Amino acid sequence: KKPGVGTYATVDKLKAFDVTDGKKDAFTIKDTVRLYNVEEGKTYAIAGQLYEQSVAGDEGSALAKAATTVKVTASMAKPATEVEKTKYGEDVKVYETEMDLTVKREDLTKNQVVKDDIALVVYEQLWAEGTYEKVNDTEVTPKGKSEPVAKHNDPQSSSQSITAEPQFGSLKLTKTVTGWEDAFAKVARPEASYKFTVKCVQKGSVDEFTLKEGEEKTVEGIPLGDTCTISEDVQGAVNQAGLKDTVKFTAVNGVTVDSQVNGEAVVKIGGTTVANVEVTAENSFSY
């Protein structure tokens, strides 16, 4: 029997949190530390670090760090999990304590649009009594070449994983028509089909579709703060109506829509601000 260490990471009792929550400036990862086959009455040092998964273990890349000393006692004992017993034996003695790892929301988002879930992971080390020169509240200083007696530096650990989950916005587009003239039209008004392409730059999306007059289409899952472009096939509209088409874009809820070329709009979907945006493209036909 040799000492071991394990961890279970949570945020507000859960395995994920909303990283695009503007009301939060930081998040606290509860790092529940499980000490295996340690000696009652000895004083160990423990350290934890929080990393984004792709750089997990890279010194300099830590989002948060914590360190402390723990004098192991019987009152800390907790029942072993089946996973713990499988690894360490059915008689493994488990002692539990905890530390907090607090990360600033801006160190996750970089104050930029968040496209995808950010995978996080907690690493932990256990240091035996006398093996560390000192401990501050972030790091254990070794005695020269000394090392922890156990580590849990496991980047694929589900137990130590946390997901920083972004929320998403959406864009609804509705087509309207004014100025139709049967003398010039080449199709029946209710059969006219108006072609659009909606692109969202941070999402990396291209959605092509048609709307008849009065129809709508929604593009979902747009990163908050994304820039979205809407492009109509204006010549296709002109060909069907037999008239010039001035496309007039509007949006509800005070959202601005910019149009620098006829049939082209740019709109922001949320902030880095309204998240479910609704735009109307009016095909204003005239001779």
Numbering used by the authors: 1 to 272, 278 to 292
Text of the article:
An adhesin from Mobiluncus mulieris, a bacterium associated with persistence in bacterial vaginosis, contains 51 repeat Ig-like domains. Each domain displays cross-linking including intramolecular ester, isopeptide, disulfide and thioester bonds. This giant 7651-residue protein, by far the largest in the bacterial proteome, is presumably retained because of its critical pathogenic role. The intramolecular cross-links, whether isopeptide or ester bonds, stabilize the individual Ig-like domains and provide a covalently linked ‘spine’ the entire length of the protein stretching from the surface of the bacterium to the adhesion domain.
Crystal structures of the mixed ester–isopeptide construct 46E–47I were solved in two different space groups. The molecules of the two space groups differ across 287 aligned Cα coordinates by a root-mean-square difference (r.m.s.d.) of 1.78 Å. Each pair of domains aligns more closely (Cα of residues 1–168, 0.72 Å r.m.s.d.; Cα of residues 169–292, 0.50 Å r.m.s.d.), suggesting that the flexible interdomain linker affords slightly different relative domain orientations. An unambiguous intramolecular ester-bond cross-link is seen to connect Thr6674 on the first β-strand of the domain fold to Gln6827 on the last β-strand. A short 2–3-amino-acid linker precedes the isopeptide-containing 47I domain. As predicted, an isopeptide bond links the first and last β-strands of this domain, joining Lys6842 to Asn6955. At the N-terminal end of the isopeptide domain 47I, the disulfide bond between Cys6895 and Cys6887 links two adjacent strands within the same β-sheet. The disulfide linkage between Cys6887 and Cys6895 identified by mass spectrometry in the 47I domain is not fully formed in the crystal structures, possibly as a result of radiation damage, and is consequently modelled at partial occupancy.
